[PDB]
RNA sequence: AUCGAGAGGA
């Protein structure tokens, strides 16, 4: 059920924009190392015969003649004149050309899109080579990470591979209906950055992000503002990017809940509300959930209108074009984005001792007799509950005072409403306060005699003792909460170390258990055996990767 | 701090006092400057990961025959630096080299843990190193039946002799200091006398796609009394694409790209990045005592003095820093503004940049890279050896052919698991169901069991297969196989 | 099972459409006529896409029911999906 | 192991020609300029002289990958006009405006140490 | 569930069971697969565990037992009961390095002798 | 181990200005006061001399193994 | 639809580098004479070792590569040197390369300090930087009792394109518009920024106001040398080998239109 | 090579039977020396049986005259002393 | 032809051929380093 | 080449 296999390579993976996502980039070294074998036909007669006289030492050559009697001429070393010529029903194994289809495979394999096919790019340094979209399918990045990649050997393997395990046709999973693949990290914050309203783009800067554009006319489309300077929005340029005439209206992450509800809903002040009208970005701002992998975003109705290989157009023009732009914008990040203000340090402060002075009122409530248990909870219960509510709704307090002190430049911020990396407890933790360090869902533990650290006094619930991190990780933490801090890290490796044999043998529990379930020509889903499971797939006889969410209008 | 009184008395009954609160880190964790600005996962990461920087692992290197042995050329101190690390000894003997950093979104080749690497500042000297490797080999005097010598074989004499050169050698069989030798190349010449004439050759090669100098070898006589020799062969490990870096707070990647000095980003005065890293990894890695170094690089560079990154002292803060930076004519927050290499235009967002400590890790992707086609193959069973170092191919395994099964590829799977694995082919009795002797050369087919001649048939399955029906029978179970 | 009656879906499926492609392709690989008018093609995964987009596919697909029987279905007489 | 030779970026291959000329279907009076063992350095400049030209309704300029060495450069003229001659006014207006450059730089350079 | 309201009760709890405990943290998964995994888990008229001591006591085939688990045990059963692999299944035919019947090997392909003109 | 001949940002050289670094060092100069008397105004530079170990002078403790 | 009609203005000239102004040129021409300061100008550097004898603590490689990092006096031989692919002759000939021969054997008790004074070369005007007739020699290995390293050396003309070490630049600064007038970068916060060297603004103000109609004019330049050129040789080297690629492009355009 | 090419559509099992093993092995009268070689040259009747199957590279099996790989594994017996309790059997 | 070790710990320059033993005449030490190559081996700058 | 162990990477 497993075992090594011939034709295959494994490499460091690293980041190439400039390929299309269903594109490899291959060193020439794994490609003059492989082969495939090529039936020799009138056709490509002449090819074949480049390619034997060229050799086994340059790359574009072979090393091997496969004589239809069975015999094989290897071509590595002496070939000789009189064996070399080859005829219709011999057959060459060329070395690995571009175009070549290849399975690229990312262990562990989990899902489907775990091993996607591929088309070789031959590139000149020593690594894969693969585009930032299809990184999510594979769960990947680059930092040390290698991927196998293996070449079928056959025209009818090949054939299959393409028609089925390309990744254009793997952008939707049948696991949750939605895409696997959609715009990652720099691509998402350039993209909300070029789509804001007050973005305007010369005609030089037009003409040059045009030039990355697979998909277009040729026609400069005319420039939302001509005097006193003609000038092109973002919204303009990726309406241009936009495939077809897909139809969506979605929803920007800074989207207020009060603004569908009164005046300006169809004119948003804030340029939420991203609404794509003829496959034109009409107004909005996009992000994560417009351009991500989530349901109803618009990949997902750019592939459920137009093909996989539109769609494929489509995410290789956003890489490249934003890219290219964000080649003239830029993004950063330091220091300067890990302050806030005066006012701001004042607030996080008044939160803190507020909250330290209400859990000192816990205390002596609780070594005063004066604490009655809540139902269903114990004393000890009742008061650590509290008090870690007390803490949490203190943490959160700072957090949103964080928030509200973050400006319009911050690039926390920018990478948070984008979607493209951090949360806003990332930059609550970096800001203003840490938080609580928890050891087993409870505070940290008394490892000593009634003491988490010999710093501190017997019974002492106190937040300080029990775990509660003050400082942010801008000002650094006491030594104290770094021991805590270091507890709670190595809780989380724990939990990463020790979970993953248990979900492995899961998953292969399941699969042999479902592995011959099929579905079968009587539109029934059988098994080895022949014993039907389900009269029709899924009750209704649909594939997975085909439905959408919808919203049924007589049930309410 | 805490003996003083205060307006509340929180224990005023102290027995002791800690020397100092850093002392509660250890030797790979002292490094990480600021660690108390960091994430535990990100510190841990780095105290794993310092054991893998190269540097200068000892001062006699140039006698110790090591087996690996990575040097770096031109190791730094780090302008920030913990004061556990005078005790360390890491300023003596640094691990890595102070780069000028700029943390900004660049052509997009930083994307996803990758960094873009200045290439004239790799052409200068910039994280290079030498890699050393080390072969043994002893002439076995243990019996008279079989003994070997170190000498050049020739073809006409030596049996075992492959299509490497053999010229390279002296007339002891060894090779001298200072040969460029390539893969699969003759440093050792032994020969053994056979029980293609009376010696077999056993010679030693050099490693496969190595390309490398002979740096010195050795001979002299092992414990029991025989020749002993040992070869180190040198070679140069420019940094490259898909080799790893890491700073000093769990910050790895690989080289996306190598620009060159007119390609990258500069200053108003003429600053090129030697590294470029993404913005994307530090907010998820909350990584400030990254940000805080390089600010206190910056400082310590215009103000010619080593940094403190001691992780608990209030004597210096970001602010400060900030401040000190500010006073030499620089943003106090570290941004530049700087230049695209390409356009020459400004770069709209003002760009994050300064010195930070880098190491170049063991992981040098000339030594991951890998492919097969037609191998050797093991013994037990024919299929494709393992480990590069074997030639050896890819396991696909059980989850492998999951996915498969699950994409419906069956000609696929049928060419990994068996067409390009282990192709074989058996003559099975038809009535018996039993594997029968057959011979190709004069075509008679032979059935010890049922005394057939006629009933045999051909079935192609792996080798595997049939090792495992064959083990089966030798545990007395009958796996008939049944055609009809 | 008569041909004048079939119980199948009239539209070929993926699997079905790579390995009917897969096949031709192979068979033209094996220098077998051609029923499109290449004008500069000479791959044969192409050719046999332009053969299929013709319906000029000389195979017929065996659709085995699970009861035991099969109906064979021409290529031509198949809806292609893509 | 893969390291392209230093000098592949500048030196040309034998059999390849420094530059092609290709028409765009798409849009009338447009060609596609190819040339290899280019770079920014020469496609900036020669975009902005295009841009400069009135009778030039697009010019742009792009590598299509970093680990090549060729340049794209798209040009779209007037009916009137052709791409192939705005090109080369382009390029000798280049060319006229580095001479005069370097002229005055050699006059800059032997007033300021003349005194 | 099962032993008190009956095998129907038992799938309808397992279901909205697993779909608790799948978008308890806002995951989703479609129906259709949630669905196949419990008629799998009760189609037999009892609920047969995902481990060896379910999937192994149905009659799925030998050689899928022995790929599944305790592989000599099902064998030596195999042996001495003289039980037959009809091969009807995928692992079966992996095992034996054939065409799986599964995906592209569902069907068989025949050559249109009247189309050739 | 020795002194680089160039700066890595920039390409200015600074190996020779390792022994008057140590001669200034020597001579009471403070470190930034030494880098501006070599003339070493970038920050880069300044890094290039100020963070350099030089393990050639403990290599050469070492006896050369021919003689 | 014609060129432009740039101006120079240098308002500083030493023998380390040159300060000056282009006015009334395009960004364009402004980054690529900036690139071709960095990558297109040709200069001498070593590149090609043979060592005879080496007992020092660094390696060969160790010793070449900062062999070919020492700069040489290219300031006229660049000229009359041709590439060696272009060259005629076997590998190497007076035409196409520069000689170089090191023999130094330390005898002393005292560290050898092995130099660039002791790259002895046939050229006499290609000769390093710090030997020409202050700053001291480049430091290439030491040496202590029985250490002695014995080479040769060749020196070819390239530019930075190939290596760094044929780069002549120790910092090309670049600028336009001190005054953010053009707002091509766009500050969060103004008052936080330092004035730039040529800004000409009060300390009251942080930027100039939003120019709508203005485009990068008046290009400020610093070309540090390396020594292997003046930087007026430098910058008008640059010049005339963008003139020349430009020139070759254009050769090669009338061809291909002649070829339609 | 005459053998048509079929494939298995179904794998019966079974125990084999002393009176098949017998018959079906290629050794006759069983292995009864324990050792394996004698002076190099393989034993008749030993472990390393020439007739079981091929021992190095460049040799041919006796009973098939098939090299490394054209030969598969030729089966042998071992006439047992008394009968034998078989341990995967023992439930049974 | 004498192919001259190197001691290791008085660097004599002794002269070894096959079939003898290893040894130092001058200070009796096991270990010696063969001599340099004579070959012209050539590295470019880079 | 086989076995076993250890150290590691994702
Ligand atoms: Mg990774
Ligand atoms: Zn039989
Ligand atoms: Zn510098
Ligand atoms: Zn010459
Ligand atoms: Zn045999
Ligand atoms: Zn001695």
């Known amino acids: 059920m497993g075992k090594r296999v011939d034709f295959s390579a494994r490499t460091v993976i690293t980041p190439d924009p400039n390929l299309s996502i269903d594109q490899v980039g291959v060193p020439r070294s794994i490609a003059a190392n492989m082969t495939f074998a090529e039936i020799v036909t009138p056709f490509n007669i002449d090819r074949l015969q480049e390619l034997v006289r060229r050799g086994n030492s340059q790359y574009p050559g072979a090393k091997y003649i496969i004589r239809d009697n069975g015999d094989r001429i290897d071509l590595r070393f002496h070939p000789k004149p009189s064996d070399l010529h080859l005829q219709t029903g011999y057959k060459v194994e060329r070395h690995m050309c571009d175009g070549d289809i290849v399975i690229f495979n990312r262990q562990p394999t989990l899902h489907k899109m775990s091993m996607m096919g591929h088309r070789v790019r031959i590139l000149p340094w020593s690594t894969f080579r693969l585009n930032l979209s299809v990184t999510t399918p594979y769960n990947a990045d680059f930092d040390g990470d290698e991927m196998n990649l293996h070449l079928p050997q056959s025209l009818e393997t090949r054939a299959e591979i393409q028609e089925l395990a390309m990744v254009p046709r793997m952008i939707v999973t049948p696991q949750s209906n939605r895409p696997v693949m959609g715009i990652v990290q720099d691509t998402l914050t350039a993209v909300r950055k070029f789509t804001k309203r007050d973005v305007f783009l010369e005609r030089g800067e037009v003409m040059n992000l045009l030039m990355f554009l697979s998909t277009w006319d040729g026609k400069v489309p005319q420039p939302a503002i001509l005097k006193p300077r003609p000038l092109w929005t973002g919204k303009q340029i990726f309406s241009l990017i936009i495939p077809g005439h897909i139809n969506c209206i979605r929803t920007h992450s800074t989207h207020p809940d009060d603004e569908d509800s009164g005046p300006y809903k169809h004119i948003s002040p804030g340029d939420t509300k991203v609404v794509v009208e003829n496959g034109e970005l009409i107004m909005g701002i996009l992000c994560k959930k417009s351009l991500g992998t989530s349901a109803g975003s618009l990949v997902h109705i750019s592939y459920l209108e137009m093909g996989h290989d539109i769609t494929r157009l489509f995410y290789s023009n956003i890489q490249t074009v934003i890219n290219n732009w964000l080649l003239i914008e830029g993004h950063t990040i330091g220091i300067g984005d890990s302050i806030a203000d005066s006012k701001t340090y004042q607030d996080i402060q008044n939160t803190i001792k507020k909250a330290k002075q209400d859990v000192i009122e816990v205390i002596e409530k609780a070594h005063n007799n004066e604490l009655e248990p809540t139902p269903g909870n114990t004393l000890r219960q009742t008061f650590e509950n509290q008090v870690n509510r007390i803490l949490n709704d203190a943490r959160d307090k700072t957090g949103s005072s964080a928030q509200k002190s973050l400006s319009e430049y911050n690039n926390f911020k920018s990478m948070v409403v984008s979607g493209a990396k951090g949360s806003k407890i990332n930059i609550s933790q970096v800001i203003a306060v840490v938080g609580q360090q928890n050891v087993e869902g409870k505070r940290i533990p008394f490892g000593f005699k009634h003491r988490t650290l010999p710093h501190f006094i017997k019974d002492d619930y106190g937040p300080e003792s029990r775990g509660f991190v003050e400082n942010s990780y801008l000002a650094g933490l006491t030594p104290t909460e770094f021991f805590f801090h270091a507890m709670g890290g190595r809780e989380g490796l724990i939990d990463t170390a020790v979970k993953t044999a248990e979900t492995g043998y899961i998953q292969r529990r399941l699969i042999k258990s479902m592995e011959s379930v099929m579905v079968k020509y009587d539109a029934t889903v059988r098994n080895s055996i022949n014993q039907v499971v389900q009269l029709r797939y899924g009750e209704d006889g649909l594939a997975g990767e085909s439905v959408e969410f919808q919203n049924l209008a007589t049930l309410k | ?484 | ?82 | 192991m893969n390291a392209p030779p230093a000098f592949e970026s500048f030196l040309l291959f034998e059999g390849e020609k420094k530059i092609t000329i290709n028409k765009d279907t798409k849009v009338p009076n447009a060609c596609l300029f190819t040339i290899n063992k280019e770079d920014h350095t020469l496609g900036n400049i020669i975009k902005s002289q295009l841009l400069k030209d009135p009778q030039v309704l697009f010019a742009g300029y792009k590598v299509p990958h970093p680990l090549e060495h060729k340049i794209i450069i798209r040009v779209q003229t007037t009916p009137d006009y052709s791409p192939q001659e705005a090109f080369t006014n382009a390029i000798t207006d280049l060319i006229s405006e580095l001479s005069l450059l370097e002229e005055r730089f050699r006059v800059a350079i032997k007033d300021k140490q003349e005194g | ?117 | 181990m020795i002194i680089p001949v160039r700066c890595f940002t920039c390409g200015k050289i600074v190996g020779n200005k390792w022994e008057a670094y140590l001669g200034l060092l020597q001579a009471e100069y403070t470190e930034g006061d030494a880098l501006d008397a070599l003339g070493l105004k970038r920050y880069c530079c300044r890094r290039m001399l100020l963070a350099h170990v030089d393990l050639i002078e403990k290599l050469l403790n070492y006896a050369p193994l021919e003689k | 639809p014609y060129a432009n009609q740039p101006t120079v203005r240098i308002t500083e000239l030493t023998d380390e580098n040159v300060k000056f102004i282009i006015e009334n040129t395009d960004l364009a021409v402004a980054n690529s004479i900036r690139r071709v300061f960095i990558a297109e100008v040709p200069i001498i550097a070593i590149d090609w070792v043979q060592i005879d004898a080496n007992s020092s603590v660094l390696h060969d490689e160790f010793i070449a590569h900062r062999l070919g990092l020492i700069p040489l006096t290219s300031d006229d031989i660049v000229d009359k040197l041709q590439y060696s692919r272009d060259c005629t002759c076997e590998e190497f000939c007076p035409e196409c390369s520069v000689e170089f021969t090191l023999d130094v054997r330390c005898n002393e008790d005292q560290t050898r300090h092995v130099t660039s004074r002791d790259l002895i070369s046939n050229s006499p005007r290609v000769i390093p930087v710090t030997s020409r007739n202050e700053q001291d020699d480049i430091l290439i290995v030491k040496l202590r009792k029985g250490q002695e390293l014995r080479l040769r050396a060749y020196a070819k003309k390239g530019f930075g394109k190939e290596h760094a070490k044929w780069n002549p630049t120790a910092g090309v600064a670049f600028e336009y518009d001190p005054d953010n007038a053009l707002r091509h970068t766009v500050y969060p916060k103004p008052e936080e920024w330092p004035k730039s060297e040529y800004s000409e603004l009060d300390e009251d103000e942080s930027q100039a106001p939003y120019d709508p109609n203005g485009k990068p004019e008046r290009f400020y330049y610093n070309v540090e040398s390396c020594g292997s050129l003046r930087p007026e040789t430098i910058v008008l080297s640059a010049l005339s080998g963008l003139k020349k690629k430009l020139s070759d492009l254009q050769t090669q355009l009338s061809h291909e239109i002649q070829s339609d | ?92 | ?46």
């Open chain 2, 1 to 484: 701090d805490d003996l003083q009184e205060k307006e509340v008395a929180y224990c005023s009954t102290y027995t002791h006092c800690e020397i100092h609160p850093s002392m509660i880190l250890g030797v790979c964790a002292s490094i990480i400057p600021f660690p108390d600005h960091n994430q535990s996962p990100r510190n841990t990461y780095q105290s794993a990961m310092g054991k893998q920087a190269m540097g200068v692992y000892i001062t006699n290197f140039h006698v110790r025959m090591d087996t690996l042995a990575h040097v770096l050329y031109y190791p730094q101190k780090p302008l920030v630096t913990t004061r556990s690390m005078e005790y360390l000894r890491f300023r003596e003997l640094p691990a890595g080299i102070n780069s000028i950093v700029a943390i900004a979104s660049y052509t997009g080749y930083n994307q996803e843990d990758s960094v873009i690497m200045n290439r004239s500042a790799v052409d200068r000297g910039f994280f290079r190193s030498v890699f050393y490797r080390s072969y043994k080999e002893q002439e076995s005097k243990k019996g008279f039946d079989q003994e070997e010598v170190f000498e050049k074989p020739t073809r006409e004499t030596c049996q075992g002799m492959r299509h490497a050169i053999y010229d390279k050698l002296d007339d002891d069989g060894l090779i001298a200091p200072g040969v460029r030798v390539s893969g699969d190349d003759v440093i050792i010449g032994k020969t053994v006398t056979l029980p293609r004439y009376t010696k077999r050759d056993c010679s030693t090669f050099l490693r496969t796609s190595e390309t490398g100098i002979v740096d010195q070898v050795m001979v002299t006589l092992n414990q029991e009394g025989y020749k002993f020799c040992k070869i180190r062969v040198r070679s140069v490990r420019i940094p490259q694409i898909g080799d790893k870096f890491a700073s000093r707070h769990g910050q790895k990647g690989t080289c996306g790209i190598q620009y060159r000095q007119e390609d990258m980003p500069f200053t108003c005065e003429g600053i090129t990045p030697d590294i470029i890293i993404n913005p994307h990894a530090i907010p998820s890695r909350m990584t400030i005592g990254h940000l805080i170094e390089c600010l206190q690089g910056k400082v310590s560079a215009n103000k010619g003095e080593i940094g403190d990154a001691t992780p608990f002292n209030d004597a210096v803060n970001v602010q400060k820093i900030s401040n000190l930076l500010s006073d030499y004519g620089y943003h106090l927050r570290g941004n530049e503004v700087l230049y695209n290499g390409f356009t020459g235009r400004k770069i709209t967002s003002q760009i994050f940049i300064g010195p930070t400590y880098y190491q170049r890790l063991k992981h040098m992707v000339d030594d991951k890279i890998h492919s097969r086609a037609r191998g050797p193959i093991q013994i037990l069973n024919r299929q494709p050896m393992e480990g590069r170092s074997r030639d050896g191919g890819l396991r696909f395994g059980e989850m492998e052919r999951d996915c498969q099964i699950a994409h419906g590829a069956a000609q696929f799977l049928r060419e990994r698991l068996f067409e390009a694995s282990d192709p074989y082919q058996v003559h099975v009795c038809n009535l018996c169901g039993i594997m029968a002797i057959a011979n190709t050369r004069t075509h008679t087919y032979e059935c010890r069991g049922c005394r057939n001649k006629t009933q045999i048939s051909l079935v192609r399955m792996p080798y595997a297969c049939k090792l495992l029906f064959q083990e089966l029978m030798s545990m007395s179970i009958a796996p008939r196989m049944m055609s009809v």
């Open chain 8, 1 to 92: 090579s005459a053998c048509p090419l079929r494939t298995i559509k179904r794998v019966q099992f079974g125990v084999l039977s002393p009176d098949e093993l017998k018959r079906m092995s290629v050794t006759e009268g069983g292995i009864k020396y324990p050792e394996t070689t004698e002076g190099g040259r393989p034993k008749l009747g030993g472990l390393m049986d020439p007739r079981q199957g091929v021992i190095e590279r460049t040799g041919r099996c006796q009973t098939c005259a098939g090299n490394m790989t054209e030969c598969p594994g030729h089966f042998g017996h071992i006439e047992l002393a008394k009968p034998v309790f078989h341990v995967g059997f023992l439930v049974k």
């Open chain 3, 1 to 82: 099972q008569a041909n004048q009656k079939r119980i199948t879906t009239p539209y070929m499926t993926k699997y079905e459409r790579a390995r009917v492609l897969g096949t031709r392709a192979l068979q033209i690989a094996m220098c077998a006529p051609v029923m499109v008018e290449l004008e500069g093609e000479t791959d044969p995964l192409l050719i046999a896409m332009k053969e299929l987009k013709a319906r000029k596919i000389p195979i017929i697909i065996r659709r085995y029911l699970p009861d035991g029987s099969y109906e064979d279905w021409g290529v031509d007489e198949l809806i292609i999906s893509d």
């Open chain 9, 1 to 46: 032809q004498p192919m001259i070790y190197i001691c290791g710990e008085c660097h004599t320059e002794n002269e070894i051929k096959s079939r003898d033993p290893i040894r130092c005449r001058e200070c009796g030490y096991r270990i010696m380093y063969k001599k340099r190559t004579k070959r012209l081996v050539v590295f470019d700058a880079r």
């Open chain 5, 1 to 117: 569930i099962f032993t008190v309201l009956g095998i129907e009760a038992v799938r309808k709890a397992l279901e909205r069971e697993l779909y608790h405990v799948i978008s308890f943290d806002g995951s989703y998964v479609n129906y259709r697969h949630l669905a196949l995994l419990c008629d799998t888990m009760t189609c037999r008229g009892h609920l047969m565990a995902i481990t060896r001591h379910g999937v192994n006591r149905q009659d799925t085939g030998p050689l899928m037992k022995c790929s599944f688990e305790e592989t000599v045990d099902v064998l030596m059963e195999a042996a001495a009961h003289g039980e037959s692999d009809p091969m009807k299944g995928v692992s079966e035919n992996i095992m034996l390095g054939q065409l799986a019947p599964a995906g592209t090997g569902c069907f068989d392909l025949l050559l249109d002798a009247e189309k050739c003109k």
